[PDB]
Design a protein around this ligand. Structure first.
Ligand SMILES: [K+]
Ligand SMILES: [Mg+2]
Ligand SMILES: [Mg+2]
Ligand SMILES: [Mg+2]
Ligand SMILES: [Mg+2]
Ligand SMILES: [Mg+2]
Ligand SMILES: [Mg+2]
Lengths: 112, 216, 122, 121, 103, 34
RNA sequence: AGUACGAGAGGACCGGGAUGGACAUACCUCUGGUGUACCAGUUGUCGUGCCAACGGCAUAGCUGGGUAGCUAUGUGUGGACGGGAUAAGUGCUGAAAGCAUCUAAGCAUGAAGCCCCCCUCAAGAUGAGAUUUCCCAAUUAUAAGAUCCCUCAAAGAUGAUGAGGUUAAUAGGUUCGAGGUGGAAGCAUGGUGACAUGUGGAGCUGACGAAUACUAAUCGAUCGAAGACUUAAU
RNA sequence: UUGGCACCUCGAUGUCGGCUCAUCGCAUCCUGGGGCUGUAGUCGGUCCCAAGGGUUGGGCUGUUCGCCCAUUAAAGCGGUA
């Protein structure tokens, strides 16, 4: 198994579930904790459970385990992690508050 | 089941497969022999009487326990042995097996089994009431004369006696304790050693008693 | 270790700088807390201009200690000060940007949002 | 070892240094049992420096042996330090340790204390 | 440790003869392998040697570093399999054998 | 902390059963001067 | 396991673990605390008309560290499940009075509670038990067998328990190792100098380990059994 | 519990809280069984069986008690000069 052969599938169920600015970052020459990140955001409190409840299955297709869904019920910022891919499900505006992309502005990024 | 006797030697550690540390004691177990198989028709219980360490033979001006005596010597050679120092009976073990005069090898213990250990404690002399039973000590400033002492003992002119199961000073130490459900790590055969995960009672050079667990 | 009437510090961009511990969230008469532990605090010193003023009770999380943690591989890690980070109802941080390292034990502690943001994990 | 003898450190370190010296001069003394099971050791570690005889041992054969006692044997004068490396060392050049010998006399009158002799061999 | 030699014999095939030498105050690097999944990477720790005790399998040391203002320390066993290698790259002079004046 | 009664003549003497002394050894008279 | 059930959302039964808080017990391999006969550093003043290499007292003269040993804030187990029945409460045949009905002749059911299962002490249990082997007379000596007495701790207020007594490795010492300190003295190069380098991971080392009869466990004394009687079977 | 009576004790029965220790009782605060209902589900409410074990740290005034922030499966009422 390998990561780069597993991120075109990672952008899959989040454009299926109609994610927006669904970009992806890498951390090869950055960090030693996780390879690549994926990012998104969503509008409605209803709309934020289905984006990531899907990812539960899609990790069971390759049969990699999931360990936590933080703020899932609260439905504000949610994080399913895999040590190679991460699904940061955001809100319409909290994306701007934390502003992920510019902390790691020095990130080779790719749009999808 | 199965049971072997031996001496506690020391304590060290080993590295597992995942580099994890596992702490271990080191049990030596040589020269065990069976000396009397039992019966229900005679005693009322089946068992296996076993003896562990060798000693010397009868002597005329004999003034130790190194050199054996005649009643002992008349019990070793019966089952074709030498005089044995320590003796114990094991009662929870199958008796159709274990013929007489043989030896008992550590090899009957695999690595990864489960056991329970039984031995003596260490000696503390005449000790108080808060090292022993472990209970609160009193103030040391603000004008106080109660520091390390057992406060009260009774109530009043009702129940003017003092009940029996009461906590006072005295002696704690060489009592019989057991430990349940430890693990077998590794089993040498030449040096005749068995290793156990965890620490077990007694002092060094003491005596240890090993047996299979009964629980699930 | 972190117990009642203990003064940690703060390592986030949320105004509160120093705090005072007054509880630990176990419950059977618990009397300490190490890394990975949700607690209750107040503030005793802030910065002018921010989002968490002085006199506000809040819950908070450890990230560093003088006493370390006993890794199962037979390894130990002890820092040279203490530190804390302030959180919210949604199990996530008040501010945004983390300062100073943290400890890897926070990955299996559902604090992945904070390793998601911090310079040096170690 | 490890005996205190009802005498605190600063006192015991000076009582065991007088015993080691006055013994050597007369080779035979009369003490209680306990003390002579402790100069059983201090003085046996003190000939083992006298067989070397080097310049360094004389420097550690003075940090326990006692101040220069101007002896007077037959028409002479010595020091307890130019008697220990010249004379005892030469008698005892071919044995191993064990050159002391304890001997039990009776008790005393006043305090009821076992009395023993100690000499060299 | 020749007591009766039964403990320093069993614990013989858990040693390793791969590791260079080092006294206190001798900078060196430490290539751990860290397992957080099906397979994971290395993540060096670098620093300066302050402590070393013991003998046998239970022989330890520790190293100090500063990292973005804060100090940190990690102490390791010498014979564990995690530690791929050790790389001593500098050497010094001191008069102590436990170093704590570094805080 | 103070005696409430008198001690009889018996209880005084039932108590001194063990309040005696002992004998030396006997080597041929010669002392056991090991 | 979103299945029984729930108007759907919600939600068990089932039964699987994973990780914990308080509490109770053994231990010292790790992390750490002490360590007053161990190792370096360092000020003041007395002792050698001084060189400082040494000692004494000044909280152990102060400071940095620390072996054996006892310790927790450290290191590992434990709580039981499982069964025998019993409260309320669920029932079935079944009479009462046809039918009825859980109690009346009957009879399954079912609570962390109760006795049994797990750990510890126990035959002065005068109801004083059960095996195994060893010892056997001319009041009377003495046998198996123990105690006095001397060397010591894995034990210990004192008694007692335990290891060993010259066919002997018990404690000490001597010769080798470990762990700890952190590079002696003394000569030799370099610096005007106080200093730093090299000969040399040096030298010293209390309590832990081994080997070795050089010292002493000498000498010698004292207690100590000789199977009753019927009434049966032999 | 506030009391009534004045039977022992005045040639001495010599003291309200809190600290240290513990011990019994249920008319049960939590856990454990169940019945009942408007308990659809949850959440309860009500009465029934049950004492094996369990039952928190701190601020103000003397504080016995009282009020208040903060946690907890729960933060029990009475006896024993
Ligand atoms: K208080
Ligand atoms: Mg006073
Ligand atoms: Mg005598
Ligand atoms: Mg003076
Ligand atoms: Mg009244
Ligand atoms: Mg009244
Ligand atoms: Mg009247």
């Amino acid at each position: 198994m390998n990561s780069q052969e597993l991120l075109a599938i990672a952008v899959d169920a989040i454009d299926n579930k109609k994610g927006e600015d669904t970009i992806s970052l890498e951390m090869k020459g950055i960090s030693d904790m996780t390879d690549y990140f994926v990012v998104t955001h969503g509008n409605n409190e209803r709309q934020v459970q289905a984006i990531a409840r899907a990812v539960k299955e899609v990790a069971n297709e390759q049969n990699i385990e999931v360990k936590r869904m933080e703020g899932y019920n609260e439905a504000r910022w949610i994080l399913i992690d895999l040590a190679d891919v991460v699904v940061h499900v955001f809100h319409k505006d909290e994306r701007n508050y934390y502003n992920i992309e510019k902390l790691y502005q020095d990130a080779p990024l790719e749009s999808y | 089941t199965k049971g072997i006797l031996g001496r506690k030697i020391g304590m060290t550690q080993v590295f597992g497969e995942n580099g994890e540390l596992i702490p271990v004691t080191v049990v030596e177990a040589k020269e065990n022999v069976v000396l009397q198989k039992k019966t229900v028709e005679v005693d009322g219980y089946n068992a296996i009487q076993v003896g562990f360490e060798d000693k010397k033979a009868y002597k005329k001006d004999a003034k130790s326990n190194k050199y054996a005596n005649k009643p002992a010597e008349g019990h070793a050679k019966k089952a074709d042995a030498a005089p044995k120092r320590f003796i114990r009976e094991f009662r929870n073990v199958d008796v159709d097996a274990y013929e007489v005069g043989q030896e008992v090898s550590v090899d009957t213990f695999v690595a990864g089994d489960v056991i329970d250990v039984t031995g003596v404690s260490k000696g503390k002399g005449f000790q108080g009431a808060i090292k022993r039973h472990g209970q609160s000590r009193g103030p040391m400033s603000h004008g106080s004369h109660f520091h390390r002492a057992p406060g009260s003992v009774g109530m009043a002119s009702d129940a003017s006696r003092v009940f029996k199961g009461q906590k006072m000073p005295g002696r704690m130490g060489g009592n019989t304790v057991t430990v349940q459900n430890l693990e077998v790590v590794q089993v040498d055969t030449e040096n005749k050693v068995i290793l156990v995960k965890g620490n077990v009672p007694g002092p060094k050079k003491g005596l240890v008693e090993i047996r299979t667990s009964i629980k699930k | 270790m972190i117990q009642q009437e203990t003064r940690l510090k703060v390592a986030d961009n949320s105004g509160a700088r120093e705090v005072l511990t007054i509880k630990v969230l176990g419950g059977s008469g618990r009397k300490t807390a190490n890394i990975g532990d949700v607690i209750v605090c107040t503030v005793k010193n802030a910065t002018p201009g921010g989002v968490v003023k002085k006199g506000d009770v809040v819950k908070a999380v450890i990230v560093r200690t003088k006493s370390g943690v006993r890794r199962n591989d037979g390894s130990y890690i002890k820092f040279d000060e203490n530190a804390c980070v302030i959180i919210r109802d949604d199990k996530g941080p008040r501010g945004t940007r983390i300062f100073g390292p943290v400890a890897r034990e926070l990955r299996e502690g559902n604090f992945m949002k904070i390793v998601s943001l911090a310079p040096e994990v170690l | 070892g490890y005996r205190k003898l009802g005498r605190t450190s600063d006192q015991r370190k000076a009582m065991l240094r007088d015993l080691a010296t006055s013994l050597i001069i007369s080779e035979r003394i009369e003490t209680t049992e306990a003390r002579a099971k402790e100069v059983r050791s201090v003085v046996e570690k003190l000939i083992t420096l006298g067989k070397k005889g080097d310049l360094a041992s004389r420097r550690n054969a003075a940090k326990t042996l006692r101040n220069v006692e101007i002896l007077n044997e037959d028409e002479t004068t010595q020091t307890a330090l130019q008697k220990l490396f010249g004379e005892i060392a030469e008698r005892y050049t071919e044995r191993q340790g064990g050159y002391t010998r304890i001997l039990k006399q009776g008790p005393r009158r006043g305090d009821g204390a076992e009395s023993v002799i100690i000499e060299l061999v | 440790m020749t007591n009766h030699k039964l403990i320093e014999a069993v614990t013989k095939s858990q040693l390793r003869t791969d590791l260079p030498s080092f006294r206190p105050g001798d900078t060196l690097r430490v290539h751990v392998r860290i397992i957080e999944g099906t397979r994971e990477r290395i993540q060096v720790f670098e620093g300066v040697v302050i402590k070393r005790r013991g003998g046998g399998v239970s022989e330890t040391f520790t190293v100090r570093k500063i990292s973005s203002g804060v100090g940190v320390e990690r102490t390791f066993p010498l014979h564990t399999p995690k530690i791929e290698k050790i790389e001593v790259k500098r050497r010094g002079k001191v008069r102590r054998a436990k170093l704590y004046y570094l805080r | 902390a103070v005696p409430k009664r008198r001690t009889s003549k018996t209880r005084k003497n039932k108590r001194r059963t063990h309040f005696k002394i002992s004998v030396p050894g006997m080597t041929e008279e010669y002392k056991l001067s090991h």
